């Protein structure tokens, strides 16, 4: 679990969005596993606007942060799950690191701000949904 709180927006994994997220929907994209909902309170986070390929992510299944080198956002095949059929997930970045299903939502940050959130994983890999291209989050 986990979310990014920026301005009057809450960014979550689309597969973990609540009834309230859907009732206050701003934008969602099944191909990216992202959903953004509106909030009444002003958020705590800054979004990176950069091309970093190194950063640190929070891994809830270890209660620890780990440094990672990750690939640029791209279209990556993701196996079928209870949430989605087998498909290509876009804007996904992979890295070697521990993750388990419940780790989705963990933030990936570089020196410039929030890069994205944990969205996929398996066998010593971890995938992050990028949010750096969503320029409207800052306005
Ligand atoms: C950190 S998720 C994870 C980690 C390790 N083994 C498995 C997983 C689960 C996982 O990859 N997905 C299930 C939930 C929806 C995901 C998606 N974006 O399509 C895919
Ligand atoms: Zn950066």
Swiss-Prot record:
Q: Which domain of life is it from?
A: Viruses
Catalytic residues identified in the record = 15 (for protease 2a activity), 33 (for protease 2a activity), 104 (for protease 2a activity)
Catalytic activity annotation: Selective cleavage of Tyr-|-Gly bond in the picornavirus polyprotein
Residues where Zn(2+) 1 binds: 50, 52, 110, 112
How does it associate, per the subunit comment?
Homodimer.
Describe the task this protein carries out.
Cysteine protease that cleaves viral polyprotein and specific host proteins. It is responsible for the autocatalytic cleavage between the P1 and P2 regions, which is the first cleavage occurring in the polyprotein. Also cleaves the host translation initiation factor EIF4G1, in order to shut down the capped cellular mRNA translation. Inhibits the host nucleus-cytoplasm protein and RNA trafficking by cleaving host members of the nuclear pores. Counteracts stress granule formation probably by antagonizing its assembly or promoting its dissassembly.
Q: What is this protein called?
A: Protease 2A
């Amino acid at each position: 679990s986990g979310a990014i709180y920026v301005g009057n927006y809450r960014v979550v994994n689309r597969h973990l969005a609540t009834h309230n997220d859907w009732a206050n929907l701003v934008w969602e994209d099944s191909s990216r596993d992202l959903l953004v909902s509106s909030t009444t309170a002003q958020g705590c986070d800054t979004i990176a606007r950069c091309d970093c390929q190194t950063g640190v992510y929070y891994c809830s299944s270890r209660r620890k942060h780990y440094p990672v080198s990750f690939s640029k956002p791209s279209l990556i095949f993701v196996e079928a799950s209870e949430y989605y059929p087998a498909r290509y997930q876009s804007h996904l970045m992979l890295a070697v690191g521990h993750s388990e299903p419940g780790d989705c939502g963990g933030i990936l940050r570089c020196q410039h701000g929030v890069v994205g959130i944990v969205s996929t994983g398996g066998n010593g890999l971890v995938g992050f949904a990028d949010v750096r291209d969503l320029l409207w989050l800052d306005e």
